[PDB]
Amino acid sequence: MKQYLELMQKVLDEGTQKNDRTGTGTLSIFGHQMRFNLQDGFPLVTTKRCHLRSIIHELLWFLQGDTNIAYLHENNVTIWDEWADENGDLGPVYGKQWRAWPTPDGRHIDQITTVLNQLKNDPDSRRIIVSAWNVGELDKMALAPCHAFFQFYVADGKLSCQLYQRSCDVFLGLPFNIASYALLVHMMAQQCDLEVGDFVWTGGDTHLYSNHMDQTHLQLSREPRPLPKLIIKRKPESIFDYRFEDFEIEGYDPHPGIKAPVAI
Amino acid sequence: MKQYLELMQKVLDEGTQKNDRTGTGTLSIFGHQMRFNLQDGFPLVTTKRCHLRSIIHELLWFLQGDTNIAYLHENNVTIWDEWADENGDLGPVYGKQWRAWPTPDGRHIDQITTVLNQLKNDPDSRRIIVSAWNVGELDKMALAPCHAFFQFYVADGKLSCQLYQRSCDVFLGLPFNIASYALLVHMMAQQCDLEVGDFVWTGGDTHLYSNHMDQTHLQLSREPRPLPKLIIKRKPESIFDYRFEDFEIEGYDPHPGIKAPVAI
Numbered sequence: 001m002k003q004y005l006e007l008m009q010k011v012l013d014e015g016t017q018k019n020d021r022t023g024t025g026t027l028s029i030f031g032h033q034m035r036f037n038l039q040d041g042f043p044l045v046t047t048k049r050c051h052l053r054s055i056i057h058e059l060l061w062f063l064q065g066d067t068n069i070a071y072l073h074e075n076n077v078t079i080w081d082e083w084a085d086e087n088g089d090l091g092p093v094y095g096k097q098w099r100a101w102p103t104p105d106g107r108h109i110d111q112i113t114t115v116l117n118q119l120k121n122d123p124d125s126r127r128i129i130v131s132a133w134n135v136g137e138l139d140k141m142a143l144a145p146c147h148a149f150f151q152f153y154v155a156d157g158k159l160s161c162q163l164y165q166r167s168c169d170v171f172l173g174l175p176f177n178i179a180s181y182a183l184l185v186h187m188m189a190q191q192c193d194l195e196v197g198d199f200v201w202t203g204g205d206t207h208l209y210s211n212h213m214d215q216t217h218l219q220l221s222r223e224p225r226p227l228p229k230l231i232i233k234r235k236p237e238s239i240f241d242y243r244f245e246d247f248e249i250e251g252y253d254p255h256p257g258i259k260a261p262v263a264i
Numbered sequence: 265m266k267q268y269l270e271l272m273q274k275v276l277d278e279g280t281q282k283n284d285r286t287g288t289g290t291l292s293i294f295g296h297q298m299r300f301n302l303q304d305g306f307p308l309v310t311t312k313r314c315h316l317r318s319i320i321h322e323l324l325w326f327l328q329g330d331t332n333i334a335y336l337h338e339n340n341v342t343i344w345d346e347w348a349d350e351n352g353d354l355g356p357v358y359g360k361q362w363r364a365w366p367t368p369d370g371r372h373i374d375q376i377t378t379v380l381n382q383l384k385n386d387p388d389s390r391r392i393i394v395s396a397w398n399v400g401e402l403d404k405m406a407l408a409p410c411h412a413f414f415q416f417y418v419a420d421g422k423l424s425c426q427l428y429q430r431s432c433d434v435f436l437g438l439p440f441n442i443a444s445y446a447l448l449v450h451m452m453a454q455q456c457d458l459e460v461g462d463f464v465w466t467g468g469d470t471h472l473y474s475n476h477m478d479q480t481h482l483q484l485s486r487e488p489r490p491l492p493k494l495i496i497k498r499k500p501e502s503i504f505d506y507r508f509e510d511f512e513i514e515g516y517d518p519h520p521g522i523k524a525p526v527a528i
């Protein structure tokens with residue numbers, strides 16, 4: 001995508017060399033924003049082939065309130081393998097926080113149900129937020145939340161969403177993240193009888209790993225193609241009733257995929 | 265300031281009319297980001313006279329972990345009066361969350377001290393964050409956190425900070441929020457022996473209240489003056505030991521003040 005390739009180039013041009021947690025080294029910038037008019041098409045990267053099944057299953061897994069990779073494995077999704085324990089658990093990550101944020105007194109808050117009811121009963125609200133950044137359970141998570149905070153917004157019958165990503169691996173994670181959130185907005189809009197608006201992505205530490213330089217240069221030489229179109233084939237009784245089988249992508253004609261190692 | 269005045273014009277140029285919680289009505293845009301290089305000068309609005317006295321006291325109050333307006337009152341600051349109860353309490357708002365975020369297992373996390381330790385021992389960390397968005401305690405708060413989540417970053421010996429403000433009253437609140445955080449960055453940098461970098465402001469629902477329109481156009485007809493300079497006269501033993509008297513703002517020649525009603 002135009003704005004994705006531009007960020008990719010910006011990181012190369014203005015990035016500072018940093019020794020990161022993995023000891024791999026990164027080139028990074030701090031503070032960046034992008035906006036995607038979802039009406040213009042589904043923001044799935046065309047300069048390299050991305051696989052929807054992993055994106056879709058991870059999102060459905062999140063909405064289930066699940067934190068164990070078992071489900072992901074039943075569907076051949078291996079993206080979280082390197083951080084799960086002997087028992088396949090990742091800790092109280094995204095899924096647990098979305099559906100059952102634990103209160104200090106033992107209760108649990110379901111942020112997704114709250115958000116649904118807000119979009120339906122009070123769309124003008126400036127508090128339609130979901131946060132995965134639970135400070136009191138951070139030490140129990142396999143990896144701290146990358147996409148950690150998002151807010152919904154409704155104007156002119158259109159639903160927009162802004163994500164704050166504290167840490168962003170531009171080559172591997174960013175394409176997944178954008179598509180995952182674009183997808184959720186479509187599901188939310190469908191469940192709330194709203195049209196899709198914009199997806200605004202805001203990043204904190206935005207980086208390119210040193211061992212992704214070749215892959216980046218390769219990708220930067222490819223011309224972006226027209227964005228695909230998402231089609232939801234069924235309308236479930238609720239936001240928790242979607243299945244992988246309900247999503248179809250039309251007109252996705254990307255450039256060949258590019259392989260790259262993950263920083264553990 | 266140039267960045268601030270451009271934002272106002274943007275809200276006016278592409279904002280949508282929205283109804284709101286206060287019943288006032290607003291002109292609103294969703295998603296915006298601006299950057300202030302702190303080395304260029306202290307970002308205190310010059311197109312209208314701002315009162316640094318209240319900005320400073322509110323910040324020291326936050327750092328103390330206080331949520332009762334008594335302290336503010338003994339210092340003649342009345343900015344939080346309309347939301348305080350009979351006892352002057354605001355509930356577990358900013359001060360409490362920054363200094364004592366309650367965990368489900370009975371602990372309390374001091375996010376300010378943790379951040380300070382991170383800046384000293386692991387400045388390259390991508391997790392130097394402070395969150396006021398405690399989902400489990402939102403129901404006890406007089407008003408949900410407007411400036412809800414901020415992240416620090418270090419590069420080239422300079423300290424940067426990005427704030428995600430979920431709701432923003434452009435005319436009244438924003439000048440306060442910008443100066444407040446720029447002040448926090450200076451204090452943090454002085455404690456960690458770092459230079460001041462950039463302050464990146466990101467907003468969710470950014471709006472102008474319907475009853476601030478005349479004031480807004482009056483302000484926009486003014487030319488910004490040179491930014492003032494911030495001088496810290498002492499280096500306290502801890503970030504919690506600053507006093508109002510340690511700060512001095514020089515070269516501040518603002519245009520006349522413009523009064524506007526606050527929406528409760």
Ligand SMILES: C#CCN(Cc1ccc2[nH]c(N)nc(=O)c2c1)c1ccc(C(=O)N[C@@H](CCC(=O)O)C(=O)O)cc1
Pocket residue numbers: 050051054078079080143169172173174176177258259260262263264
């Ligand atoms: C974001 C996110 C979720 N995640 C989780 C997640 C967890 C830790 C991380 N760590 C680092 N260093 N970068 C990441 O982007 C990252 C992402 C992902 C994990 C792996 C792949 C990945 O290896 N992608 C391959 C496809 C492999 C496959 O289809 O199985 C690719 O080339 O695209 C993508 C996303």
Ligand SMILES: C#CCN(Cc1ccc2[nH]c(N)nc(=O)c2c1)c1ccc(C(=O)N[C@@H](CCC(=O)O)C(=O)O)cc1
Pocket residue numbers: 315318342343344407433436437438440441522523524526527528
């Ligand atoms: C942000 C923030 C902190 N706060 C708290 C705070 C709480 C609720 C809010 N509610 C609304 N609708 N807008 C706000 O900006 C806002 C701000 C402020 C509160 C009041 C003023 C205010 O009345 N502005 C006058 C100040 C006069 C005085 O000093 O007493 C001004 O002309 O600036 C500014 C900041």
Ligand SMILES: *c1cc(=O)[nH]c(=O)n1[C@H]1C[C@H](O)[C@@H](COP(=O)(O)O)O1
Pocket residue numbers: 021143144145146147167168169170172173174177263390391
């Ligand atoms: C985390 C997972 C995700 O959804 N998106 C991402 O891009 N990432 C990346 C960021 C970073 O490279 C690594 C997480 O490491 P850290 O916690 O920031 O040190 O995965």
Ligand SMILES: *c1cc(=O)[nH]c(=O)n1[C@H]1C[C@H](O)[C@@H](COP(=O)(O)O)O1
Pocket residue numbers: 126127285407408409410411431432433434437438441
């Ligand atoms: C809240 C407090 C602050 O520091 N700064 C702000 O700009 N505000 C504003 C935002 C909004 O106009 C109102 C809070 O209302 P709501 O919770 O968003 O409905 O005060």
